[PDB]
Tab-separated table of C-alpha atoms and ligand atoms in Angstrom:
chain	number	residue	atom	x	y	z
A	22	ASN	CA	27.003	-41.274	-97.855
A	23	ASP	CA	27.640	-42.859	-94.128
A	24	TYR	CA	25.817	-46.323	-95.058
A	25	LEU	CA	27.421	-47.256	-98.363
A	26	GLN	CA	30.784	-45.806	-97.131
A	27	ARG	CA	30.248	-48.299	-94.547
A	28	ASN	CA	29.830	-51.112	-96.545
A	29	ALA	CA	32.858	-49.919	-99.143
A	30	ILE	CA	35.259	-50.466	-95.823
A	31	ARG	CA	33.505	-53.820	-94.662
A	32	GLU	CA	33.690	-55.416	-98.329
A	33	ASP	CA	37.724	-54.141	-98.105
A	34	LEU	CA	38.081	-55.459	-95.491
A	35	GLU	CA	36.116	-59.093	-95.841
A	36	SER	CA	38.409	-59.152	-98.790
A	37	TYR	CA	41.621	-59.006	-96.718
A	38	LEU	CA	40.460	-61.706	-94.422
A	39	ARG	CA	39.533	-63.879	-97.153
A	40	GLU	CA	42.959	-63.704	-98.632
A	41	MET	CA	44.403	-64.534	-95.074
A	42	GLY	CA	41.780	-66.909	-94.636
A	43	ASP	CA	42.335	-68.813	-97.947
A	44	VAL	CA	46.197	-68.884	-97.593
A	45	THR	CA	46.263	-69.734	-93.571
A	46	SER	CA	43.872	-72.634	-94.905
A	47	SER	CA	46.557	-74.015	-97.254
A	48	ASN	CA	49.475	-73.480	-95.344
A	49	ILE	CA	47.402	-75.503	-92.835
A	50	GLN	CA	46.660	-78.555	-95.303
A	51	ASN	CA	50.488	-78.455	-96.437
A	52	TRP	CA	51.440	-78.608	-93.192
A	53	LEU	CA	49.170	-81.649	-92.201
A	54	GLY	CA	49.937	-82.960	-95.701
A	55	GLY	CA	53.749	-83.589	-94.704
A	56	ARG	CA	52.669	-85.724	-91.906
A	57	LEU	CA	49.487	-87.838	-93.389
A	58	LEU	CA	51.833	-88.432	-96.474
A	59	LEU	CA	54.994	-89.753	-93.612
A	60	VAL	CA	51.874	-92.063	-91.800
A	61	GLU	CA	50.371	-93.201	-95.633
A	62	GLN	CA	53.835	-94.131	-96.903
A	63	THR	CA	55.051	-95.859	-93.470
A	64	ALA	CA	51.944	-97.728	-93.410
A	65	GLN	CA	52.347	-99.177	-97.213
A	66	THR	CA	55.799	-100.217	-96.063
A	67	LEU	CA	54.331	-102.251	-93.129
A	68	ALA	CA	52.217	-103.715	-95.087
A	69	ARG	CA	55.080	-105.290	-97.312
A	70	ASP	CA	56.890	-106.128	-93.958
A	71	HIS	CA	55.742	-106.570	-90.613
A	72	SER	CA	58.094	-108.530	-89.295
A	73	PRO	CA	58.817	-107.090	-85.502
A	74	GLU	CA	62.505	-106.441	-86.554
A	75	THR	CA	61.072	-104.102	-89.448
A	76	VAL	CA	58.391	-102.518	-86.906
A	77	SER	CA	60.968	-101.703	-84.801
A	78	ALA	CA	63.787	-100.061	-87.418
A	79	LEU	CA	60.723	-98.485	-89.123
A	80	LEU	CA	59.084	-96.525	-86.272
A	81	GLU	CA	62.883	-95.605	-84.789
A	82	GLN	CA	63.169	-93.958	-88.352
A	83	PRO	CA	64.341	-90.544	-87.538
A	84	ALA	CA	62.244	-88.918	-90.034
A	85	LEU	CA	59.158	-89.872	-87.586
A	86	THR	CA	60.602	-89.727	-84.661
A	87	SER	CA	61.493	-85.948	-85.334
A	88	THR	CA	57.893	-85.181	-86.485
A	89	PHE	CA	55.818	-87.115	-84.261
A	90	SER	CA	55.615	-87.561	-79.894
A	91	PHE	CA	54.859	-90.741	-81.119
A	92	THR	CA	54.735	-92.729	-83.530
A	93	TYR	CA	53.381	-96.776	-83.490
A	94	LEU	CA	51.559	-99.743	-85.120
A	95	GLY	CA	48.656	-101.109	-83.184
A	96	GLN	CA	47.480	-105.098	-85.092
A	97	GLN	CA	44.464	-106.640	-85.219
A	98	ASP	CA	45.381	-108.766	-82.240
A	99	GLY	CA	45.597	-105.864	-80.078
A	100	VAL	CA	49.515	-105.772	-79.841
A	101	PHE	CA	50.789	-102.021	-79.743
A	102	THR	CA	54.990	-101.477	-80.666
A	103	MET	CA	55.405	-97.730	-80.176
A	104	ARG	CA	58.727	-95.177	-80.980
A	105	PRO	CA	59.940	-93.503	-78.785
A	106	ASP	CA	58.975	-95.224	-75.139
A	107	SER	CA	56.282	-94.395	-72.830
A	108	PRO	CA	55.133	-95.991	-69.291
A	109	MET	CA	51.810	-97.031	-70.564
A	110	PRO	CA	48.370	-97.153	-68.528
A	111	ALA	CA	47.150	-100.914	-67.350
A	112	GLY	CA	44.868	-102.389	-70.121
A	113	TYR	CA	45.627	-100.361	-72.978
A	114	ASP	CA	44.135	-101.813	-76.390
A	115	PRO	CA	44.921	-99.814	-79.291
A	116	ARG	CA	41.994	-100.751	-80.735
A	117	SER	CA	39.913	-99.424	-78.764
A	118	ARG	CA	40.826	-95.933	-79.427
A	119	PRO	CA	39.808	-93.074	-81.697
A	120	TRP	CA	42.601	-93.158	-84.087
A	121	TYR	CA	41.845	-96.416	-84.592
A	122	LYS	CA	38.726	-96.682	-85.031
A	123	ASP	CA	38.543	-93.654	-87.223
A	124	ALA	CA	40.926	-95.185	-89.492
A	125	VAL	CA	39.100	-98.318	-89.792
A	126	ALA	CA	35.892	-96.578	-90.332
A	127	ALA	CA	37.263	-94.123	-93.246
A	128	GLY	CA	39.216	-97.304	-95.007
A	129	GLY	CA	42.383	-94.873	-95.199
A	130	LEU	CA	44.018	-91.592	-94.040
A	131	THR	CA	41.991	-89.677	-91.438
A	132	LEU	CA	43.189	-86.990	-88.465
A	133	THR	CA	41.395	-87.753	-84.984
A	134	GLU	CA	39.869	-84.688	-83.492
A	135	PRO	CA	41.876	-83.961	-79.870
A	136	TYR	CA	41.417	-86.781	-77.555
A	137	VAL	CA	43.215	-87.536	-73.931
A	138	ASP	CA	46.008	-89.625	-74.897
A	139	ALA	CA	46.576	-92.622	-73.232
A	140	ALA	CA	49.669	-92.123	-71.627
A	141	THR	CA	50.958	-88.463	-71.331
A	142	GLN	CA	47.210	-87.504	-70.747
A	143	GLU	CA	46.934	-84.443	-72.896
A	144	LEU	CA	44.642	-83.945	-75.369
A	145	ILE	CA	46.395	-85.015	-78.578
A	146	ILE	CA	45.666	-84.940	-82.571
A	147	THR	CA	46.894	-88.231	-84.412
A	148	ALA	CA	46.788	-89.162	-87.829
A	149	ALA	CA	46.452	-93.218	-88.978
A	150	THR	CA	45.610	-95.279	-91.831
A	151	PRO	CA	45.453	-98.847	-91.853
A	152	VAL	CA	47.823	-101.455	-92.834
A	153	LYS	CA	45.887	-103.128	-95.739
A	154	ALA	CA	47.390	-106.095	-97.125
A	155	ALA	CA	45.239	-107.075	-100.358
A	156	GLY	CA	42.701	-106.217	-98.459
A	157	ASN	CA	43.289	-107.560	-94.814
A	158	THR	CA	43.940	-105.155	-92.321
A	159	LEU	CA	46.763	-105.632	-90.271
A	160	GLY	CA	46.123	-102.417	-87.965
A	161	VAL	CA	46.402	-99.203	-88.328
A	162	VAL	CA	49.682	-96.657	-87.768
A	163	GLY	CA	49.313	-93.337	-85.897
A	164	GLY	CA	51.451	-90.699	-85.903
A	165	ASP	CA	50.378	-87.661	-81.895
A	166	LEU	CA	50.834	-84.194	-82.707
A	167	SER	CA	50.958	-82.189	-80.495
A	168	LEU	CA	47.585	-78.770	-80.236
A	169	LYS	CA	50.548	-76.672	-78.651
A	170	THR	CA	52.148	-77.466	-82.264
A	171	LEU	CA	48.840	-77.057	-84.721
A	172	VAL	CA	48.377	-73.223	-83.097
A	173	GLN	CA	51.454	-72.245	-83.798
A	174	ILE	CA	50.919	-72.998	-87.371
A	175	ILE	CA	48.104	-71.696	-88.213
A	176	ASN	CA	48.957	-68.356	-85.369
A	177	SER	CA	52.806	-67.974	-87.637
A	178	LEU	CA	51.510	-63.849	-87.938
A	179	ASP	CA	49.390	-61.971	-86.044
A	180	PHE	CA	47.285	-60.307	-88.414
A	181	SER	CA	48.449	-56.798	-88.242
A	182	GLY	CA	47.902	-57.811	-84.730
A	183	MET	CA	44.184	-57.572	-85.629
A	184	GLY	CA	43.341	-61.290	-84.070
A	185	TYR	CA	44.498	-64.919	-83.556
A	186	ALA	CA	43.319	-68.224	-85.697
A	187	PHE	CA	41.791	-71.202	-84.496
A	188	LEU	CA	40.789	-74.802	-85.913
A	189	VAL	CA	37.058	-75.942	-85.961
A	190	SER	CA	34.788	-78.852	-87.384
A	191	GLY	CA	32.052	-78.755	-89.397
A	192	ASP	CA	29.915	-79.275	-86.541
A	193	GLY	CA	31.026	-76.308	-84.053
A	194	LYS	CA	33.572	-78.393	-82.453
A	195	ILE	CA	36.493	-75.828	-81.678
A	196	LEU	CA	39.394	-78.151	-82.431
A	197	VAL	CA	42.394	-76.257	-81.759
A	198	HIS	CA	43.095	-72.842	-80.235
A	199	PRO	CA	45.534	-70.127	-78.757
A	200	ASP	CA	43.528	-70.196	-75.704
A	201	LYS	CA	43.704	-73.614	-73.919
A	202	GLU	CA	39.870	-73.118	-71.827
A	203	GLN	CA	38.244	-73.109	-75.263
A	204	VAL	CA	39.033	-75.760	-76.634
A	205	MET	CA	36.754	-79.058	-77.478
A	206	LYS	CA	34.149	-76.245	-76.784
A	207	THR	CA	31.509	-75.648	-79.297
A	208	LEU	CA	30.681	-71.975	-81.188
A	209	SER	CA	27.740	-72.916	-79.114
A	210	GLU	CA	29.128	-72.818	-76.098
A	211	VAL	CA	31.468	-69.975	-76.786
A	212	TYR	CA	28.788	-67.851	-78.147
A	213	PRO	CA	25.603	-68.331	-76.292
A	214	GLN	CA	24.032	-65.109	-77.527
A	215	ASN	CA	24.946	-65.150	-81.167
A	216	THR	CA	26.184	-68.112	-82.723
A	217	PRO	CA	28.053	-67.672	-84.921
A	218	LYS	CA	27.628	-70.153	-88.453
A	219	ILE	CA	30.271	-71.713	-90.260
A	220	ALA	CA	28.365	-70.642	-93.993
A	221	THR	CA	29.468	-69.339	-95.793
A	222	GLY	CA	31.131	-65.851	-94.916
A	223	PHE	CA	31.798	-63.197	-92.080
A	224	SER	CA	29.867	-62.708	-88.605
A	225	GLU	CA	30.096	-60.774	-85.889
A	226	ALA	CA	30.133	-62.520	-82.214
A	227	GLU	CA	30.776	-60.939	-78.644
A	228	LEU	CA	33.648	-62.599	-76.684
A	229	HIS	CA	35.185	-61.310	-73.864
A	230	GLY	CA	33.790	-57.972	-73.665
A	231	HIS	CA	34.715	-57.200	-77.088
A	232	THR	CA	32.959	-57.537	-80.594
A	233	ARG	CA	34.903	-59.868	-82.913
A	234	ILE	CA	34.486	-60.832	-86.654
A	235	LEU	CA	34.661	-64.087	-87.174
A	236	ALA	CA	35.215	-65.794	-90.918
A	237	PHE	CA	35.432	-69.446	-91.760
A	238	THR	CA	37.554	-70.837	-94.681
A	239	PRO	CA	37.647	-74.652	-95.479
A	240	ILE	CA	40.545	-77.007	-95.066
A	241	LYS	CA	40.719	-78.601	-98.187
A	242	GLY	CA	42.766	-82.191	-98.358
A	243	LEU	CA	42.180	-83.577	-94.944
A	244	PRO	CA	40.973	-87.178	-95.623
A	245	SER	CA	37.788	-88.417	-93.769
A	246	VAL	CA	37.325	-84.904	-91.917
A	247	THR	CA	35.600	-81.653	-92.474
A	248	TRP	CA	37.185	-78.734	-90.581
A	249	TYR	CA	37.230	-75.013	-91.131
A	250	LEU	CA	39.946	-72.154	-90.218
A	251	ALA	CA	38.728	-69.512	-88.323
A	252	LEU	CA	39.687	-66.100	-87.914
A	253	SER	CA	38.893	-63.940	-85.250
A	254	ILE	CA	39.430	-60.554	-85.409
A	255	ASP	CA	38.968	-58.003	-83.430
A	256	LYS	CA	36.916	-55.375	-85.069
A	257	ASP	CA	37.284	-52.241	-83.594
A	258	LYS	CA	41.095	-52.666	-84.438
A	259	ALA	CA	40.728	-54.243	-87.672
A	260	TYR	CA	38.921	-50.426	-88.921
A	261	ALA	CA	41.300	-48.737	-86.829
B	301	LIG	C1	50.634	-93.924	-75.261
B	301	LIG	C2	49.866	-92.778	-76.408
B	301	LIG	C3	48.966	-93.420	-77.644
B	301	LIG	C4	50.589	-94.308	-78.133
B	301	LIG	C5	48.316	-93.134	-78.489
B	301	LIG	N1	48.337	-91.733	-78.447
B	301	LIG	C6	46.855	-93.176	-77.595
B	301	LIG	O1	46.663	-92.622	-76.631
B	301	LIG	O2	46.331	-94.644	-77.728
């Protein structure tokens, strides 16, 4: 009867959303991965040669400057070198920054959560890794990514007009979202009454007057972090 057909329709939809979540998660994994690779390659080059002349020429290579807003080296002694140039706030110390600390704590590649950029003052995410030469940490290489760029990547398609995608941490922190007002809120703040759980399937919740279906897919291949690709789908539209 109705209930079994209700379930048949629901499972069909969940199957479709699962597919979508999978290949969308892979897409963002692979996009982020190319950037992680540049940072890794850059740090490994610097481990062998970090003279001021090499640092300058390296950070100026177009494969970096056309990929990141800024690419930079923060050294163990606090010295900072960045391309391209920017006005910089007084007091700046790269060793105090989230990207530096996250990279050293991970002992290798990392992605920060959004943090307030020192110069542009906007939220950004950074790919970073320590520069290690024979066990000696010389400093950390970082490359900055705009949140705007990331929302574009995971929202390449509009899911038949059913909804959109966002990024969220395992602890429920919204990292990247089409709605700037939702960024760095938690799932619990956005959904105080009936909070979607990250494990391990599908949830309904109410947003802006409408029932949405939320589904979370792990993003693999992100070193040191546990992030999910979330689909947020208008429920009534989806079943139509
Ligand atoms: C100017 C920005 C620097 C390079 C980095 N994104 C930071 O805020 O620490």
